Design a protein around this ligand. Structure first.
Ligand code: CLA
Ligand code: CLA
Ligand code: CLA
Ligand code: CLA
Ligand code: CLA
Ligand code: CLA
Ligand code: CLA
Ligand code: CLA
Ligand code: CLA
Ligand SMILES: CCCCCCCCCCCCCCCC(=O)OC[C@H](COP(=O)(O)OC[C@@H](O)CO)OC(=O)CCCCCCCCCCCCCCC
Lengths: 39, 738, 118, 80, 61, 144, 75, 150
């Protein structure tokens, strides 16, 4: 389990999780606030 | 003695080596110091020969890898069936195949991408799919979304079984090397069980499920009203109502009175006129014959009993005066080198995929397929590309064998040796014939361009000026069309409409008509011959000179993949066989792009179109326009690019976006192909200085990509760009004019 | 060692190559030139007549084709002369190659004129 | 002929000599390094300029240098 | 010059590790021209981490 | 050690004949002749492509360029533990021995070799290209 | 070479162009560069490149030399 | 070449929309690259590529031929740009073998030994073909579109 957490701490897995979080956050913001251009 | 041989518990299942990147390589297990390491880690991840010298461990690794691939493919099939059941218009399409467009992908309503869900009919909105799954599913007799859902669950379960099989046969019970080396037994089991029992069980499903359901679908009864398949197995009286042969049961089979099975095992030929596909009775007879043939073929090699042939004995028996020892040593080569096997299997698997493309366009096997012009173009093009890639791969792994596994002290005056020993003659003759083909094939086009530009059309190579008729192909075509009358008496029609004859139309569209070959067809076929010969030249030169040349006498010691041997001796860039694969990749792209252009223009000009006479999609301009480059430039690319360039504001807008994106990626590749890593390393030096100034220089040192990686990135973005460009062009064109 | 093939080491091939006029080793370079020219101009007169730009006009197709064949024979004789001027500074000498090129000019023009006189 | 030079940073590791595919370099007695060995290039007329020696040299910077010069039939690696 | 294990700073201008810091392995006491063996925790483009230097090319910093 | 002589009457390895052998350079300019003595009959790899059987005793091959003889020397020296020497032969008949020109192989030091092409300075101690402008030719600053 | 280039432009305009006809109405008349002699042509090409007002096939110049020469005083 | 191609695409399309009368077309379509590819390159090359066709020819056939000529020289430059030396050196060595072994053509021999082009020469020849094709393609397109539509 320690080795599995080290594997999850490796670089492409963290890039995948972090870009999934960032893309989902932007997707959620563009859903609930549709089409923002200003402010 | 053929038997099961297995080692118990060789490799422990543990997450430890997941947490140590590059564990498999003694060099890469030291850790990263520069950025090059990462790329190496992914490049050498699956090169199992460079991991261990033990053929057994390598063989086990490739076995479990193959299981992983099969599990991935099963996940993919599961996905296609599930999306076909849950997010499609398949039932509506079943109720009206001629006026509903097959769609099995829907997009979510965010950031305006909702427009991609277009009006495909059936009260549905989505992206029209061109994989041909709907026609496959109707041909298999599927009628409801529930059956597709159950197929999805089944394929997912099978994927879990494949990944368990991988884990099991690597970590728990891993086969021994003498298990893997039982190639005679492997051929017997694969020819009998795989191909033989495969086509036998499929013919079983066809005869018992496909034929009645599709006979009712062609009769016109509502799919929901059609009896479920299990009722067809259960009550043989219904089977006897549709085909009275089934009343007598399996008595004519065992009593050898097979003529009474003529209701569902036919030899009609042609296409089903109300449906535009091959007769499923012909397909059932075909799979029964194929089954019996392969089950006969699978009992050829000796295993644990005296009967049966021996592969090494058949090889060592064929020796002549011209070739010396002949096929001696080839058995030893093909039972110890995975790369040789991969070369052979890739060559025939690619060639087979190209044959699949041609035979599936020419003899449409699925119902309502020939008139789904987008599906036909997509399938032909796709399988042609897959084919070409596998051929280039064959050349690659042939060369990899030549460098790593070739050992002449078991291979001394042999077929392979003599080929190596007269390679200069081989390459020089191939060289000359490539230049000859290039000059006369391309020169006719340049000649025509010049004459047309100079206002002298009577001096061109065309059907009205200096004619160059494909007399041989026309003769073969005529013979094929006249074959049912004399040389195939039991055939009611020719095997394909393209030989000649009448015209089969479905829903006002042309399914297939006779294809005529003239001067333009002569010219494109010799262009094809030229490009194929050049690709063969590059790849074959790569494999024959992989070990040595007059330039690099000891090239074998430098490996398969290496940048060069320095700027000396005039310059030795791209001397490696890998670099020959790299150039062969570009030439393969060239060849197959002209092939799919030939197919697209010829079908839209002389075959497809609506029936009122037939009004073709491009009016029949091929015969007069396909003799000049300006003709291809204007009447094909420029003319048919209208749909892609004006696809904005509609559901096809994604094809415009991917048109532009693909152009961009193609161009982006030119930086890697045209430049070199010295410049980039120095640029990175300046940038590293800037990062050092602000205490943000990484501990893993930024390095420019290697020479070979620059070439690899280059050719990959080049192929992706060009192929995706033609993809967007093709799909937008054929969907809007289809 | 050199690879053995029927093509490079056949006796009929050796006799045919020894009988062709570029090999006899004791005939004059003028004679070799006029024989090679009588062969090559006679074969070269054909495709200009049959496929040239005036091929569909009567009585002038053969004239224009033979005239273009004579022009190409003149270009080939100039090529032979400059090849000899570059290479050599009995057939493989400066005087011998100049004799051979003049013989090729004469024999090629004679071969074109005999392919017309037809 | 290509210009091949040896510089006094040589540590006599013999790597360049065993990397040259042409037998151009050799090791001579010397006193400037602990190995008491120095490289030397007495046969640069047969040098093609492949720079395997430069790839094999460990010192930073290089102790063997190949300056590509005028080409001959031996330096172009021609067999014809 | 500097003793074993001490940190120096390289001032040979064409070195890869010029204006940077390494660690002394040994200093040879013969008439060798470049006796100071310095190891570096990062590799050059050749993948080498060790180089000989002179007494006036290293500064104990 | 004395400089050995070429014996042209030395038996050659068993070889069926490649298309990658000699050309007109061997007849006009030079070709090279490699000679070794084997301990047993054994198959090796020809540098021009193909396989060949070396004889038991004196062997003799002839190649076009020098790197072919070096490649066969490296193969016979690292794979078979043999000691070959290859010569340079002209169409005059002039025979030029080399490798090992000292008799001892160049990968080890031998007393008596004169050091050639040795700059007694660093590479960073070279002059600038302004200091070598307008000589009789193109010069690099490392030439002086 | 530059002055021979300029003298050649002047000579080919003066012999094969329409400068004296261009200066009468330089809005509707195209500036001829030089005449075409190409024996590889056909009669449709000769008729097509024979634009006007010229005898045979011409090229229409896009180098501005008629405008420059007319402004600096050539007539 | 990229930068001057950008500045002259921009110059030419803004002036074509000034000369036709609809500067609104440039002001609307200039803000997106599909508007570029559709309304400049696809649109203004309609009379260029109709310079010759199977119905006849007209005065723009020299510019259609030169347009294809520039595309061809550009493409030929890509060969020297992508493929490098040692491939061609091995190919030329097999050609040297074939010529020296062919009977009745080995009576003719070269004075200069044939070798593949060097690395620097290859870069120069590829950049030269690339540049000449670039120049001829845009010259043919610009002259033919402006002269055919005005
Ligand atoms: C690099 C140039 C560039 C710029 C300046 C923009 C800018 C924008 N894009 Mg565009 N876009 C771009 C490239 C760019 N994009 C590319 C390359 C693509 C193709 C992949 C797109 C495809 C695209 C789509 C499909 C859409 C946009 C949209 C937008 C708007 C998003 C506003 C937002 O996300 O909410 C605000 C976001 C936040 C507040 C998140 C930040 C969180 C921090 C904590 C805020 C801190 C503030 C203090 C914004 C004007 C959306 C739009 O409607 O345009 C009008 C939209 O639907 N873009
Ligand atoms: C799930 C339980 C499990 C665990 C803990 C292990 C553990 C191990 N395996 Mg085993 N094995 C398993 C199941 C497991 N295996 C399965 C299911 C298979 C069949 C594929 C195998 C077949 C197998 C082989 C052939 C080998 C191993 C090896 C190993 C050892 C090292 C491998 C490693 O660290 O890389 C961890 C690997 C990864 C994290 C990558 C997973 C790759 C999958 C297939 C990717 C598929 C993704 C797909 C392509 C989607 C991509 C989309 C797009 C982004 C491209 C380690 C002890 C190796 C060994 O023992 O060497 C001495 C070895 O050679 N295993
Ligand atoms: C696409 C199909 C595919 C298949 C069948 C494999 C199979 C394998 N990969 Mg590979 N891999 C792939 C794609 C694939 N890979 C791709 C596209 C890349 C990026 C280039 C890699 C990068 C990669 C690395 C760096 C390594 C592997 C390794 C392996 C082996 C160990 C996998 C394992 O034990 O985990 C078992 C898998 C599971 C238990 C299920 C997967 C679950 C994960 C978390 C998702 C196995 C033979 C390892 C190896 O070769 O060891 C010698 C290894 O170190 N792969
Ligand atoms: C008649 C029995 C039989 C059948 C049907 C197969 C079928 C296959 N083998 Mg073969 N194999 C067999 C006997 C058989 N084998 C024997 C006796 C040997 C030893 C001489 C081998 C040695 C061998 C090797 C080394 C490899 C194969 C591989 C394959 C697969 C090729 C991929 C493909 O295109 O299939 C299409 C895919 C399908 C038809 C999917 C259905 C597959 C299921 C599992 C049915 C196949 C029957 C299977 C043998 C039963 C296993 C039961 C198990 C619980 C004990 C295919 C599934 C390759 C592979 O991919 O490994 C994973 C491979 O590398 N086989
Ligand atoms: C040999 C190759 C082959 C292939 C590729 C197929 C493929 C298919 N069959 Mg067919 N079938 C075959 C042989 C084959 N069959 C033979 C030889 C017979 C004669 C017995 C049948 C009799 C048959 C029937 C009666 C039906 C199919 C159906 C199907 C389709 C859905 C099955 C599925 O994916 O769910 C995966 C399968 C399961 C999840 C099984 C679930 C349990 C069921 C109820 C079976 C219970 C009894 C059984 C012995 C276990 C699928 C296209 C179904 C269909 O869609 O028809 C339109 C269907 O109803 N097949
Ligand atoms: C290869 C695949 C395949 C399969 C699976 C079938 C299957 C079938 N066909 Mg056939 N058929 C096929 C190919 C196939 N066909 C081909 C290629 C042709 C063309 C020649 C035909 C032509 C044909 C005709 C004309 C007819 C059939 C019929 C049948 C059905 C009955 C046959 C029979 O009596 O078998 C013999 C019986 C068995 C094999 C018994 C099976 C063994 C049992 C299940 C073992 C159970 C043991 C276990 C211990 C007990 C269970 C315990 C458990 C409950 C706990 C059966 C569904 C008949 C039918 O019903 O039509 C609708 C029929 O009239 N077929
Ligand atoms: C337009 C683009 C283009 C063209 C024309 C060429 C042309 C050629 N390639 Mg190249 N190639 C290209 C792109 C191109 N390539 C690119 C982009 C790459 C990078 C991947 C390569 C990489 C590559 C490889 C790896 C190989 C080739 C080879 C060849 C030659 C094939 C032999 C032949 O067909 O001779 C016939 C000549 C032609 C088809 C050229 C047109 C000739 C015209 C029609 C007639 C000429 C007469 C002329 C008009 C008279 C001029 C007179 C005037 C001077 C006064 C041919 C010269 C191959 C080779 O040389 O082996 C034989 C080979 O192996 N190329
Ligand atoms: C490359 C392929 C190719 C081919 C086959 C042709 C063919 C032709 N051209 Mg075209 N042309 C080409 C490329 C080609 N061209 C290119 C690239 C351009 C642009 C530069 C042109 C520009 C052009 C113009 C401007 C004209 C032509 C014309 C012609 C026609 C007359 C030519 C002629 O009379 O030559 C003379 C014939 C020969 C020199 C024959 C030599 C070749 C022989 C037959 C080879 C035989 C080898 C033999 C089999 C070996 C046997 C060995 C054994 C005995 C031992 C002819 C149909 C003319 C025309 O009007 O046509 C209607 C014409 O005016 N061409
Ligand atoms: C390198 C290639 C090149 C080429 C092919 C051209 C081509 C052209 N230029 Mg351009 N030009 C170039 C580079 C080039 N230019 C450069 C590098 C500059 C910046 C210096 C210019 C600046 C330029 C201007 C400002 C103009 C041109 C113009 C032209 C066009 C008219 C032809 C011409 O120049 O007449 C040949 C010119 C001469 C032979 C010299 C003219 C007289 C000189 C200036 C003074 C003579 C003094 C006299 C001898 C002194 C007597 C003293 C007295 C006391 C005795 C032609 C398209 C003209 C144009 O566009 O017209 C439509 C135009 O107005 N060019
Ligand atoms: C014709 C070729 C006959 C070939 C043929 O009949 O070979 C037959 C000949 C028979 O050899 P043996 O009878 O000694 O072979 C015995 C065993 O080795 C094979 O069972 O094989 C050779 O001698 C090799 C010579 C290859 C010569 C290569 C010529 C290649 C020409 C390529 C042109 C192809 C054009 C058409 C392609 C579709």
């Amino acid at each position: 389990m320690k080795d599995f957490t080290t594997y999850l701490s490796t670089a492409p897995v963290i890039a995948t999780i972090w870009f999934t979080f960032t893309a989902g956050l932007l997707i959620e913001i563009n859903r609930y606030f549709p089409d923002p251009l200003v402010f | 003695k053929v038997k099961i041989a297995v080692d118990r518990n060789p490799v422990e299942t543990s997450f430890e080596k997941w947490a140590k990147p590059g564990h498999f390589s003694r060099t890469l297990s030291k850790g990263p110091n520069t950025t090059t390491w990462i790329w190496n880690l992914h490049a050498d991840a699956h090169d199992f020969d460079s991991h261990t010298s033990d053929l057994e461990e390598i063989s086990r690794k490739v076995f479990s890898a193959h299981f992983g691939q099969l599990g991935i493919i099963f996940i993919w099939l599961s996905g296609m069936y599930f999306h076909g059941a849950r997010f499609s218009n398949y039932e509506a399409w079943l109720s009206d195949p001629t006026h509903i467009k097959p769609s099995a992908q829907v997009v979510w309503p965010i950031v305006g991408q909702e427009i991609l869900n277009g009006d495909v009919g059936g009260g549905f909105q989505g992206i029209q799919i061109t994989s041909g799954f709907f026609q496959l599913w109707r041909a298999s007799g599927i009628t409801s979304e529930l059956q597709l859902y159950t197929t999805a669950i089944g394929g997912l379960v099978m994927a879990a079984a494949m990944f368990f099989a991988g884990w099991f046969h690597y970590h728990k019970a891993a086969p021994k090397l003498e298990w893997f080396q039982n190639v005679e037994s492997m051929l017997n089991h694969h020819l009998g069980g795989l191909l033989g029992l495969g086509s036998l069980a499929w013919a079983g499903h066809q005869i018992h499920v496909s034929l009645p359901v599709n006979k009712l679908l062609d009769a016109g009864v509502d799919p929901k009203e059609i009896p479920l398949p299990h009722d067809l197995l259960l009550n043989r009286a219904i089977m006897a109502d549709l085909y009275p042969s089934f009343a007598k049961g399996i008595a004519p089979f065992f009593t050898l009175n097979w003529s009474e099975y003529s209701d569902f095992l036919t030899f009609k030929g042609g296409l089903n006129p109300v449906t535009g596909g091959l007769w499923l009775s012909d397909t059932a007879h075909h799979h029964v014959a194929i089954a019996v043939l392969f089950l006969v073929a699978g009992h050829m090699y000796r295993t644990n009993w005296g009967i049966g042939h021996s592969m090494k004995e058949i090889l060592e028996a064929h020796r002549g005066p011209f070739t010396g020892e002949g096929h001696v040593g080839l058995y030893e080569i093909l039972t110890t080198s995975w790369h040789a096997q991969l070369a052979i299997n890739l060559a025939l698997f690619g060639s087979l995929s190209i044959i699949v493309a041609h035979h599936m366009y020419a003899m449409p096997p699925y119902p309502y397929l020939a008139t789904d012009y987008g599906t036909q173009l997509s399938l032909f093009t796709h399988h042609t590309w897959i084919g070409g890639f596998c051929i280039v791969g064959a050349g690659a792994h042939a060369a990899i064998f030549m460098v790593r596994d070739y050992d002449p002290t078991n291979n001394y005056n042999n077929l392979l040796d003599r080929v190596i020993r007269h390679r200069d003659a081989i390459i020089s003759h191939l060289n000359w014939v490539c230049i000859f083909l290039g000059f006369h094939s391309f020169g006719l086009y340049i000649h025509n361009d010049t004459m047309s530009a100079l206002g002298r059309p009577q001096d061109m190579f065309s059907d009205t000026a200096i004619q160059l008729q494909p007399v041989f192909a026309q003769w073969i075509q005529n013979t094929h069309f006249l074959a049912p009358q004399l040389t195939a008496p039991n055939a009611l029609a020719a095997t394909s409409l393209t030989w000649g004859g009448d015209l089969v139309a479905v829903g006002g569209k042309v399914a297939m008509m006779p294809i005529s070959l003239g001067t333009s067809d002569f010219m494109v076929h010799h262009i094809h011959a030229f490009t194929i010969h050049v690709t063969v030249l590059i790849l074959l030169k790569g494999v024959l000179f992989a070990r040595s040349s007059r330039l690099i006498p000891d090239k074998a010691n430098l490996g398969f993949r290496f940048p060069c041997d320095g700027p000396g001796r005039g310059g030795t860039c791209q001397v490696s066989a890998w670099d020959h694969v790299f150039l062969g990749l570009f030439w393969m792209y060239n060849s197959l792009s002209i092939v799919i252009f030939h197919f697209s223009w010829k079908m839209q000009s002389d075959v497809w179109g609506t029936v009122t006479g037939v009004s073709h999609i491009t009016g029949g301009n091929f015969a007069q326009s396909a003799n000049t480059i300006n003709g291809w430039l204007r009447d094909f690319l420029w003319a048919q690019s209208s749909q892609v360039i004006q696809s904005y504001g509609s559901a096809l807008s994604a094809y415009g976006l991917i048109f532009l994106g693909a152009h961009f990626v193609w161009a982006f590749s030119l930086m890697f192909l045209f430049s070199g890593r010295g410049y980039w390393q120095e640029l990175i030096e300046s940038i590293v200085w800037a990062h050092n100034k602000l205490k943000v220089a990484p501990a893993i040192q930024p390095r420019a990509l290697s020479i070979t990686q620059g070439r690899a990135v280059g050719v990959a973005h080049y192929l992706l760009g060009g192929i995706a460009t033609t993809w967007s062009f093709f799909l937008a064109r054929i969907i809007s004019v289809g | 060692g050199m690879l053995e093939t029927p093509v490079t080491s056949a006796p009929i091939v050796a006799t045919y190559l020894s009988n062709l006029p570029a090999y006899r080793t004791g005939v004059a370079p003028v004679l070799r030139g006029v024989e090679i020219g009588l062969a090559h101009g006679f074969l070269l007169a054909g495709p200009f007549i049959k496929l040239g730009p005036l091929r569909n006009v009567p009585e002038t197709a053969e004239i224009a084709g033979s005239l273009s064949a004579a022009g190409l024979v003149l270009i080939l004789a100039l090529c032979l002369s400059i090849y000899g001027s570059a290479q050599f500074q009995p057939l493989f000498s400066a005087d011998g190659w100049s004799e051979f090129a003049a013989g090729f000019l004469v024999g090629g023009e004679a071969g074109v004129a005999w392919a017309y006189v037809c | 002929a290509h210009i091949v030079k040896i510089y006094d940073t040589c540590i006599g590791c013999t790597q360049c000599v065993r990397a040259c595919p042409l037998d151009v370099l050799e090791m001579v007695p010397w006193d400037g390094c602990k190995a008491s060995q120095m490289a030397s290039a007495p046969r640069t007329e047969d040098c093609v300029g492949c720079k395997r020696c430069e790839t094999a040299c460990p010192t930073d910077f290089l102790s063997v240098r190949v300056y590509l010069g005028s080409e001959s039939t031996r330096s172009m690696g021609l067999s014809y | 010059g500097p003793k074993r294990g001490s940190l120096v700073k390289i001032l040979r201008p064409e070195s890869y590790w010029f204006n940077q810091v390494g660690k002394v392995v040994s200093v040879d006491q013969s008439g060798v021209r470049y006796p100071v063996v310095v190891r570096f925790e990062n590799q050059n483009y050749a993948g080498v981490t060790t180089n000989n230097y002179a007494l006036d090319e290293v500064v104990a910093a | 050690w004395t400089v050995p002589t070429l014996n042209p009457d030395t038996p050659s390895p068993i070889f069926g004949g490649s298309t990658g052998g000699l050309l007109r350079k061997a007849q006009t300019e030079e070709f090279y002749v490699i000679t070794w003595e084997a301990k047993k009959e054994q198959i090796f790899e020809m540098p021009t492509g193909g396989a060949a059987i070396m004889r038991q005793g004196p062997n003799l091959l002839k190649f076009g360029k020098k790197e072919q003889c070096l490649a066969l020397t490296t193969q016979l020296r690292n794979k078979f533990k043999l000691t070959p020497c290859f010569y340079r032969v002209f169409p005059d008949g002039k025979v030029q021995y080399l490798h090992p020109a000292d008799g001892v192989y160049p990968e080890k030091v031998n007393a008596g070799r004169v050091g050639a092409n040795q700059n007694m300075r660093r590479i960073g101690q070279n002059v600038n290209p302004i200091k070598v402008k307008f000589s009789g030719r193109m010069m690099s600053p490392a030439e002086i | 070479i530059i002055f021979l280039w300029t003298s050649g432009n002047l000579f080919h305009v003066a012999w094969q162009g329409n400068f004296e006809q261009w200066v009468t109405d330089p809005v509707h008349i195209r500036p001829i560069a030089h005449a075409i002699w190409d024996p590889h042509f056909g009669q449709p090409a000769v008729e097509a490149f024979t634009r006007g007002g010229a005898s045979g096939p011409v090229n229409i110049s896009t180098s501005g030399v008629y405008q420059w020469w007319y402004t600096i005083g050539m007539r | 070449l990229n930068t001057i191609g950008w500045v002259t695409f921009y110059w030419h399309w803004k002036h074509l929309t000034l000369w036709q009368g609809n500067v609104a077309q440039f002001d609307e379509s200039s803000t997106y690259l599909m508007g570029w590819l559709r309304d400049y390159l696809w649109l203004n090359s309609s009379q260029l590529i109709n310079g010759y066709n199977p119905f006849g020819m007209n005065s723009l056939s020299v510019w259609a031929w030169t347009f294809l000529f520039g595309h061809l020289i550009y493409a030929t430059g890509f060969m020297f740009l992508i493929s490098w030396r040692g491939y061609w050196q091995e190919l030329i060595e097999t050609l040297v073998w074939a010529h020296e072994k062919t009977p009745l053509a080995n009576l003719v021999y070269w004075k200069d030994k044939p070798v593949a082009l060097s690395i620097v020469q290859a870069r120069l020849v590829g950049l030269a073909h690339f540049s000449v094709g670039y120049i001829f393609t845009y010259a043919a397109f610009l002259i033919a579109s402006t002269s055919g539509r005005f």
